[PDB]
Structure formats: C-alpha cells, structure tokens
Amino acid sequence: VNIVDYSDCFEGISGGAIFCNTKNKEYNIYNKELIETRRSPCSTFKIVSTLIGLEKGVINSKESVMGYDGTDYPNKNWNKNLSLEEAFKESCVWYYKKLINKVDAKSVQNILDDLKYGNCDISEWEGDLKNGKGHLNGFWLESSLQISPKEQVQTMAKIFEGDTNFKKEHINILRDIMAIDVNDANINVYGKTGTGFDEKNKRVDAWFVGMLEREGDTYYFAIKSDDSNKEITGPKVKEIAINIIKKYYS
C-alpha cells in the first residue's frame, strides 16, 4: 500500500480513490478510511448483474433485448427495446431489474459470495421501497448490498484477470460495453458510473469503477465521493477519475 494525494483532481469534492496494479500487487490509495468503507454500489452493480445475466442465459450478447413492454419513462432512451449495450450505457433500471428478477436468489447469493462482493447482503431484494419508487428499486440501490471501493477493485481484478468461472466470452462482452472514450488513444479506459444518495447520512454515493490499460500495465480502480453536495453524481466522479488517470497514470 502506497498512500497518495489526488486531492488536486477532486476540485474540492470529498472523496477517495484506489488504483491496483496486480503485476506488482501494490495499491495506490487516496483517503484510506473512505476506500475501506462499504457503501451501496448503486449502478456500478450493473457490471456484475450483466455477468450474472449472461451466465444464466437471460442475455447472450451485447445485442440482447429484455422485451420492452411500452411503459412510459421520462428518459426517452428507456422507451425502447434497447440492447444490453445501450441499457448498460444508459444505466436503464427497468432493463436490469427485469434481468435480475429472472434469476433466483440463491444463484445470485452464491455468485456474490464467490466474488467476495462486499457484504453479499441481498436480503432486501426489492430495495429501498421507502423512497416511493416501487419497482425502480433493488438490493443494489441504496439498500442492503454494500461494498467498499477497495473490494470493488478486488472484484474487478478477479473478473477481468480471468480468475472467476465466468466465461471468457462473457468477460469480453463486458469489456466491450464498459469501454469509454477519454480522448487519449494511448490508454484504454473501461468503467461504470454509479449515483445514489444515502438519506440516513445525507451524503452522496457517487462512483466510477473500472480499469485502465496502458502499454502492458493494467490498473483496476475505484473512485468514490461521499460529499454532502447532492449535485455530485457518478458522471461528476467519472470526470475526476479521468483527470486522475491523465495526471498520474499516463
């Protein structure tokens, strides 16, 4: 473990970051207390739920559809029979709720246990119903399931280094749909945003989790904000993550 100071890239926002290179097995850690604290993964869970759906055959490729039924939603891009790739990039909750509700709870429990996915607590399957949002809820959305940024990186490394039983074909679909454009062709960046608000503590859960490939080296990373400013979202933390990557990992 190497303690580092990325505060310049956070532009005043409360947060932490952890980067792990598995070739030399060292973590670079900014704000160790936060990096070790379990929080709801929010939509960063879509990394794992995609793999669960592929493993169980609910979906099969980046084209796979979930049978849109015409329900009206405010985001125009949710109002269609969108593919896995666009559901992942739009963070489309109905697609992923329908996907996971096709999988039995014991299969999910055992997969999370195998991945050491934080507290592996899916006891509140329907999620945080007190927020009034009904079926737009689940155990991974400010609910029972909690994971630390460090555990996120450890899970990411296990998956994408080939250390799980997930099919390589399925890992490669995830890599495809997680790729992001960072206006720098000499690095490959992959990840997923997550946005939630922790009502009990009045702090955001804003995430960007993924990996970086740069000339032979691979780094697994998790950037997390716990700021009390409700305007801090997953996409904002993704901007911070890209600034860290360009300043310190080029």
Residue at token pair 């939630």: 196
Question: Running DSSP on this structure, what letter comes out for residue 53?
Answer: H
DSSP assignment of 56-116 equals HTS--STT----------SSGGGSS---HHHHHHHT-HHHHHHHHTTS-HHHHHHHHHHHT
Cα 195–chain centre separation: 10
Write phi, then psi, for 195 (nearest 5 degrees): -135, 125
Structure tokens at 46: 């879509």
| CATH (domain of 77) | 3.40.710.10
Structure tokens at 87: 């559901």
| 43 Cβ contact list (under 8 Å, min separation 6) | 91, 93, 140, 141, 192, 193, 194, 195, 207, 234
- Domain enclosing residue 151, as ranges: 2-248
SS3 241: helix
| Resolution stated for this PDB structure, in Å | 1.6
Structure tokens at 167: 């099919």
Distance, in Å, from the CA atom of 118 to the CA atom of 44, rounded to the nearest integer, reads 13
Residue 196 has a CB neighbour count (10 Å cut-off) of 23
Structural domain count of the chain = 1
